């Protein structure tokens, strides 16, 4: 669920998921589609590709079990669909952290940039 995702993002990036990534670029956030503007945005594109293919559970509301163990994320979820959700979320948290070096606050304001047509997953 968004609760686990938000915690993972805090754990890995040190950032507030909602304020830093709730509306960033063409892919980070509800309703956001379009070609990625930078590496952070690409993380969010990959993430949506990852979870949108799952049919048997809900990314937003279904909670799952994971541990923050030895300063990393371990998906410890028995439900196969929720384990896949967890892996998608783990991947985006890591990706966002690895790309902090190019995070750009300009992409938090939708009017400041244009979005090209989305690429395929």
From Swiss-Prot:
Keywords: Disulfide bond, Heparin-binding, Myotoxin, Secreted, Signal, Toxin. Disulfide bonds join 28-44, 43-95, 50-88, 57-81, 75-86. It comes from the Eukaryota. Its main location: secreted. It is found in: Secreted. One of its GO terms (molecular function) is heparin binding. One of its GO terms (biological process) is phospholipid metabolic process. Expressed by the venom gland. Heparin and wedelolactone inhibit the myotoxic activity. The PLA2 inhibitor, para-bromophenacyl bromide (BPB), inhibits the myotoxic activity. One of its GO terms (cellular component) is extracellular region. Binds to heparin. Belongs to the phospholipase A2 family. Group II subfamily. K49 sub-subfamily. Snake venom phospholipase A2 homolog that lacks enzymatic activity. Has myotoxic activities. A model of myotoxic mechanism has been proposed: an apo Lys49-PLA2 is activated by the entrance of a hydrophobic molecule (e.g. fatty acid) at the hydrophobic channel of the protein leading to a reorientation of a monomer. This is Basic phospholipase A2 homolog MT1. It comes from Agkistrodon contortrix laticinctus.
